[PDB]
Amino acid sequence: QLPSTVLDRVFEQARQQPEAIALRRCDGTSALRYRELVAEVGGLAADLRAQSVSRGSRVLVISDNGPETYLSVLACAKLGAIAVMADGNLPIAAIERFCQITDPAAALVAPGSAVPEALHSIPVIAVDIAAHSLDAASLAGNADQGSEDPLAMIFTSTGEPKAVLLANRTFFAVPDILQKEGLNWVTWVVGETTYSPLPATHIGGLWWILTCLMHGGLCVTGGENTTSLLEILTTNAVATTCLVPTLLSKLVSELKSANATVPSLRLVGYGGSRAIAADVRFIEATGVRTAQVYGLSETGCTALCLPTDDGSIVKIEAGAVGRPYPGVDVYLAATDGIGPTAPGAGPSASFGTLWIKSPANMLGYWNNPERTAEVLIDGWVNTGDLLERREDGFFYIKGRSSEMIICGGVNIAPDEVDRIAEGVSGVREAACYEIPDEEFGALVGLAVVASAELDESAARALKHTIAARFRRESEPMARPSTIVIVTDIPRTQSGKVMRASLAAAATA
Amino acid sequence: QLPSTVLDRVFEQARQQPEAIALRRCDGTSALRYRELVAEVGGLAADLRAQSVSRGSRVLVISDNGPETYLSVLACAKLGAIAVMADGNLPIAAIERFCQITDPAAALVAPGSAVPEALHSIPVIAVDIAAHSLDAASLAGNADQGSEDPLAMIFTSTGEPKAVLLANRTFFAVPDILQKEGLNWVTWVVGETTYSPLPATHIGGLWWILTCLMHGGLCVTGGENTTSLLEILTTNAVATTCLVPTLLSKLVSELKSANATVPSLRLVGYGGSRAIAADVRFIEATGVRTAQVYGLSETGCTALCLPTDDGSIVKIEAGAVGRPYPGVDVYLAATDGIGPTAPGAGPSASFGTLWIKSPANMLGYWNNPERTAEVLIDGWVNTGDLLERREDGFFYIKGRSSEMIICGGVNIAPDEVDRIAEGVSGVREAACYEIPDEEFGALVGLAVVASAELDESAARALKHTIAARFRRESEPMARPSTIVIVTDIPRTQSGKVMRASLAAAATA
């Protein structure tokens, strides 16, 4: 039986490999060995204790996505305090808003990114690191916390922001399931190097690093010196990383612009928005295993998973988000206002709003019982997302299918649009895709591959030429609403254009 | 030739009918005759002058939607100052945000709805009224302003708010067109009573009252004592009013709940969201003329209009928003990034993003040249809305047509859904409607008329019964996503269900 708190599971790794490096930035500064982490947690928690910060107290962790932030989280955990995750880049008014919601007892400021008015009334502690033996006095003193005790808070927006309270179990519930069931969808390897572009104030970022820390991994976060992702993954020789479809799309573009490969890369976790099947297939060709994750902050990150397997690329293109881990219960509410907690009807539908009952679910929105009671009922979380459980057992976030692009009410054949587009001089290859529209059904989006290498002006010139061509040759509604110059066009082995991969990339 | 500023046009009415009442609340307090308005404008402008408020200066008008607010606007106009419209109900952080954007020289506070930090550094003037001859010293002293000089600012949001700078011409450009062209789409009658539920910080509210003030009308605003609209319109015997589809829908419900009528009501102006053809037809049966208006804050309120006429209800149901006033130029950009200001292509399409060139258009977003240059180019405003100019000359904000409700990819017949629903015991009448969805094409929305009069519990009980019925009798995707108990179901004279009126009301 593993320890029941995040901090204890981390310290257990610190006992096995105390000299192993735990946290460091991309360049290498703010580096912490596991023994240095334990020592610094104790010191910072001692500094917090001098500011009336006790068990249950809330601490505003002004994040920098670096080692100092996750140190600050674990320092709060030592007191049994709650680490309120606040983005350092955000304007003062946002952070001032955060303080009013959470009413923190103190603030932990990690460098780096003129302070809010609320911080003038509360204690503020600066947290930074510089460049022995495993101290047993810092290993002792862990507050008697449990899996149900709150650890951190993550903010989520439609307009107004809410504070998602997360217990310790959120960060190990699913990993323990994968271990117990002997599943390989997402795996950790002790000592291996990982990187997170996702901020610590992001549910995906905070969750990922903590899971890696509890598995004794080398976690590289914060201190980005380059906009290049290919560089960081190869410079630091990472094995695993957590991405959003936009960032994975960026990486693939870099892996194409240069005949490149990240050999050290073993596993890629991706999610947050519409998956791009083209980018996933490309990186699986490299030999890297991937796993799509579906979830919310309210569900403690991942709840459904889509790991690398036969036919995976096919269903990801069809809009599959995956299927739940064993122990995570799912329910499709066909009618609004009638969930699984409603008496009578009924069994889960094959289509409807997704309700999730997971051991990683939130405790509830902080200081907001009214809204919490609309989303969290009897352990079930209303995701508010429409899903479809198809006849294969997978859940799809979009529906099938548009064979023609029906704009307004007129059926528009993609082959015709492609033909007209390809009839233009400067174009080598062209493919259109469907852009959904509530008012007009669908829109015509057009991806274009230029024969030559165009600058900013030549590309714009080609764009206006293609549009003027459609104005004359085609008719409404068969006129492209958007025309974009793309490096390449993803196709199946049958030669069929993967238009969903184009659409997903168009939004991202 | 009429005066070129709003203030001068108002004062001209104050010369014709100085004893006529200009502004008052719903109950009757804060009442101002036109001569009392002129006197109070001068005094308040004198009070502003003592706080370094000169021509071009910006004044934060903390609105209350009452007479004191519009007094404050006209007082700013006297100095040639800009009245920054700020909602009093909004939280401190919002108003603090407003001050940072506009950098005001002073603030005019009208009672009623703990002040922002920014107001501690700027002068603050309280403005309230209580209970002779037309003073010629207050009639004189109007700063030499023109139609192009800025008068007020209106804030608009996706997430972040922008300050829309509006010149004087915004408030009389279109009215002057209607007068010159001899059109009757929207008319004013001197002395008549008008009411505005829309706030002064709303573009529709501020615009409406100012137009009525310049036409010498009795303007009732602010100081709402009841939630009943039927009462206010009948108590104060108004002739005209400005509404949003939600409020018009509310009024109709009240006009049904009691066998009632607003006889004094002559004209109803409505717009802002999807028009409900059922509610419009109902109030036109009363004998009241209506006019739909399409526009943005960036276009100085209304730009297109749909007045009461033969076949109007038919096209409003089809999603028509109207057609431009003579002088207002429209352009449908078929492809994103290619507007009317783009060289080459082309003539206006019959489908695309609407660009509007109007004499009522904004001057630009305050202190934001970058975003202004993306929306306001050579006098054209990018509405960002997809419109379709059908073969009748009207512009439609939605497309035709869903004959079947295609959820996922399955064609679903409304007659079948209606039948299953009506087969339930407690239901007298039932009709479904299409709810557009980007991911699944469409959803099934269901409107239900109960045979008896149900309380809150009996209605919920009926709802769950109907849903459980569809779970068993029907199949996905033909299961209703939403089930609502409605008072009645709008039909044509042919008996056909006006399902768009149901959908529009469902969103509102």
Ligand SMILES: CCCCCCCCCCCC(=O)OP(=O)(O)OC[C@H]1O[C@@H](n2cnc3c(N)ncnc32)[C@H](O)[C@@H]1O
């Ligand atoms: C290895 C694991 C870490 C690597 C991945 C880290 C990213 C995963 C963290 C996700 C949680 C998060 O971002 O917070 P939020 O509450 O905003 O998300 C919820 C909203 O987002 C959308 N959505 C999430 N999943 C999605 C997915 N699969 N397909 C498509 N839409 C997805 C949904 O529409 C939902 O409304």
Ligand SMILES: CCCCCCCCCCCC(=O)OP(=O)(O)OC[C@H]1O[C@@H](n2cnc3c(N)ncnc32)[C@H](O)[C@@H]1O
């Ligand atoms: C007698 C005249 C006064 C009585 C009416 C007063 C209300 C009219 C004032 C409207 C201006 C306003 O509300 O500001 P905003 O910039 O938010 O509006 C712009 C947005 O709103 C939507 N939209 C406006 N018009 C609409 C209409 N006709 N159909 C459907 N959608 C309409 C559009 O989608 C647009 O994106």
Ligand SMILES: [Mg+2]
């Ligand atoms: Mg997300």
Ligand SMILES: [Mg+2]
């Ligand atoms: Mg609006």
